[PDB]
Amino acid sequence: AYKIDGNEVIFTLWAPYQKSVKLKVLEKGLYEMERDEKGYFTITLNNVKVRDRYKYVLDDASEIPDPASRYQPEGVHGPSQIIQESKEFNNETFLKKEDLIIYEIHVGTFTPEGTFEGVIRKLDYLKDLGITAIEIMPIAQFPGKRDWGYDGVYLYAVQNSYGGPEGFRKLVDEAHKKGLGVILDVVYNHVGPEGNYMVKLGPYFSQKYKTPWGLTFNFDDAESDEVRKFILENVEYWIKEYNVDGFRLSAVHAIIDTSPKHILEEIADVVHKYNRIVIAESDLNDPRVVNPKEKCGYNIDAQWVDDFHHSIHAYLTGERQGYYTDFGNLDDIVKSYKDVFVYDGKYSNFRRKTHGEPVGELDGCNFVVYIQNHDQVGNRGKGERIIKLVDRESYKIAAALYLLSPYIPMIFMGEEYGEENPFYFFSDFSDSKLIQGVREGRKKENGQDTDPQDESTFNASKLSWKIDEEIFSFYKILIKMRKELSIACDRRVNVVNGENWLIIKGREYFSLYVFSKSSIEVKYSGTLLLSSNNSFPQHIEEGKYEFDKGFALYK
Ligand SMILES: OC[C@H]1O[C@H](O[C@H]2[C@H](O)[C@@H](O)[C@@H](O[C@H]3[C@H](O)[C@@H](O)[C@@H](O)O[C@@H]3CO)O[C@@H]2CO)[C@H](O)[C@@H](O)[C@@H]1O
């Protein structure tokens, strides 16, 4: 994009497809740019200040925003803007992976405001709940106001309608004062379908394959050095310019790289260079994502493990559609509890292939688990939260299973107080083809009948903030007991199961998960820390008990 250099500013556009490019500074001038042989265009200017707006005009005289824009005040087709530029950052995150309890937030819907300011207003509540890091869904500028974020199209530009650069920086600074970390969801596997102008510039995109969401970045073919650079500088930029704590990488199985060093390893190298954390959403069931270099891995800090969610959801709801077909047994939950992946190199009927690989001795803090998140709610056609799909006891049992697991737990916004509103897929394109495409694709892929482009679809997805006190208090105590029992990262657990029950015993605790009234042989003693109802004894000893449906934590 641009580099401020005392009182001058250098503009750089990578555009090998283009014979000649002009810098257009709105209400100032047009300036010819110098071309190097790799196709970078440069010009250094003296008359540019903060708030100045610009575009680049191409060979065919067409005008485009800066692909590396730091701010798009008028959206994805408007001009780019020069910004404030406080390059101020801590050399370390204070976040410790082992203490991580994550809370996923969609900014537009989290709060009536729908902005960063709205999330600042909730920091005290979040802190008090006991979360240690917030995970922000993508903020790279996308079309309109209503989008999950995965249609982001300007990787360095903070969404205008969320409050732009200033709002986000204020959010992170305020989060830090309250002792909360911020994790940014970033998308390096594709670009959204409206408002991306990189195709006219050079081979940003791979000819080699496609994601379900668009063409993917070119990391390993002709001219890919510069595209690797575009992505790697983006990770550096979020750290230095916004003092962000870490990242959640969208769909790393869709980032394909046959280079000698995988771009995923380089991504982690940048984040580790600045002592930050990265988490990968990976559908590979392959420890290489998370293995250290010495074990041939990319050394990413942790990965999402859908198998854990899927085990719990399928078993508790009886659902078997789509990917749930691969799950549904109690055994699947115990397998994920013991071995992390259910598919650790076993035939998948859903995938029609052998899937995954065992994880070895990696500790629990290489993985993140959840009973809810924006996908497991929002990719449902009716967008239902799991609260609508199981009874109250099972909801509490589910919450306990993940929050007391050895893995890093992630809470979906609202889950903790028993939110009941759906979370739908919504979008805000203005290109009529994409408007028709999204409705038709989403109806077909997801069975979504609400219109993604209809504002009511977004309004309906806003949190109500209607507190179920009994559920909220139950979450708070879970989170606190997790910390006090040193549950985190520790995979040394013993698991016994019968038909309709599970007992899980760690170093300092044991839990009873009674799915259905059962006579159970309890091999341990302890004192009761928390229970989902009042039927469990305060002190229990070794013996046989007939329990009603519920959950209890001892010791
Ligand atoms: O018509 C817009 C777009 O819709 C569909 O793509 C969306 C997916 O339906 C939706 O699930 C979401 O997918 C992202 C996940 O939510 C997220 O966790 C991440 O890891 O990766 C996914 C892609 O980034 O968002 C996409 C994009 O909006 C449809 O498949 C597309 O063809 C269509 O372009």
In angstroms, the Cα distances linking 480 to 19, 243, 365, 485, 494 are: 61, 28, 18, 9, 22
Would you list the domain boundaries of the chain?
A: 1-85, 94-425+461-490, 494-555
d(CA 318, CA 394): 12
DSSP 449: -
Q: How far apart are CA 555 and CA 542, in angstroms?
A: 13
Task: Say which experimental method was used.
Answer: X-ray
- Rounded distance between C-alpha atoms, residue 266 and residue 257, angstroms: 11
Tally of residues, the chain: 555
Separation of 332 CA from ligand 1 center, angstroms?
Answer: 28
Q: What are the E-state strand segments in 47-167?
A: 53-57, 63-64, 80-81, 102-105, 133-136, 140-141, 154-158
Its CATH class, for the domain covering 494-555, is mainly beta
Contact in structure between 102 and 133 (CB atoms under 8 Å): yes
Query: Candidates 213, 217, 284: which one to mutate for ligand 1, based on the most atoms within 8 Å of Cβ?
Result: 213
Tell the residue nearest (CA) to atom 29 of ligand 1: 213
Rounded distance between C-alpha atoms, residue 281 and residue 372, angstroms: 14
Burial class (CB in 10 A: 0-12, 13-18, 19+), 32: exposed
Pick the residue whose CA is nearest to atom 12 on ligand 1.
150
Is the Cβ atom of 283 under 6 angstroms away from ligand 1? no
Q: Which atom of ligand 1 lies at the shortest distance from residue 378's CA?
A: 11
Q: CATH fold of 94-425+461-490, please? A: TIM Barrel (3.20.20)
Contact yes or no for 213/143 (Cβ under 8 A): no
Q: In sequence order, which ranges of 318-419 are alpha helices (DSSP H)?
A: 330-339, 374-378, 392-403
Give, for 237, the enclosing helix (H) or strand (E): helix 224-242
For residues 141 and 159, the answer to whether their CB atoms sit within 8 Å is: yes
Q: CB 117: neighbour CB atoms within 10 A?
A: 17
String of DSSP letters for 169-192: HHHHHHHHHTT-EEEEEE--S---
HSE at residue 377, side-chain half, CA atoms within 13 A, is 26
Could you count the other beta carbons within 10 Å of the beta carbon of residue 38?
A: 11
As a whole number of angstroms, the distance between CA 40 and CA 33 comes to: 9
User: What DSSP designation does 16 have?
Assistant: T
DSSP E strand stretches across 305-441: 346-348, 353-355, 367-369, 408-412
AA identity, residue 105: I
The reply to whether domains 1-85 and 494-555 share a CATH topology is yes
Residue nearest to atom 7 of ligand 1 (CA): 213
CA distance 524 to 522: 6
Angle made by CA atoms 338, 339, 344, in degrees to the nearest 5 = 150
Domain 1-85 has CATH 3.40.50.150: no
Q: What angle do CA 259, 264, 266 make, to 5 degrees?
A: 80
DSSP string, 457-516: HHHTTS------HHHHHHHHHHHHHHHHTT-TT----EEEE-SSEEEEE-SS-EEEEESS
Atom number in ligand 1 closest to CA 438:
1
Choosing from 135, 146, 150 the residue with most ligand 1 atoms within 8 A of its CB, the one to mutate for a pocket test is 150
Tell which residue, 36, 46, 30, has the closest CA to residue 15. Answer: 36
- Closest by Cα among 87, 96, 102 to 135: 102
Distances in whole angstroms, Cα of residue 524 to Cα of each of 406, 515, 517: 20, 19, 20
Residue 253's contacts (CB-CB under 8 Å, 6 or more residues apart) are: 282, 283, 284
User: How many degrees, rounded to 5, is the angle at CA 127 between CA 124 and CA 128?
Assistant: 85
Report whether residue 151 contacts ligand 1, using a CB cutoff of 6 Å. yes
> Which protein residue's CA is at the shortest distance from atom 11 of ligand 1?
379
Determine whether the shortest distance from the Cβ of 250 to ligand 1 is under 6 A: yes
Asked if 97 contacts 408 with a C-beta cutoff of 8 angstroms, the reply is yes
Give the three-state DSSP class for 107: helix
User: Which of 121, 193, 198 lies closest to 156, judged by CA?
Assistant: 198
Is residue 388 within 8 Å of 403, Cβ to Cβ? no
One-letter-per-residue 3-state SS of 70-96: CCCCCCCCCCEECCCCCCCCCCCCCCC
184: tokens are 């940014």
Per the listing, tokens 């300007």 go with 154
Residue 238 contacts by C-beta under 8 Å, 6 or more apart in sequence?
Answer: 184, 186, 244, 247
Backbone angles phi, psi at 5, to 5 degrees: -135, 80
Q: Which atom of ligand 1 is nearest to the CA of 375?
A: 16
136, 108 Cβ separation under 8 angstroms: no
Resolution as reported, in Å = 2.3
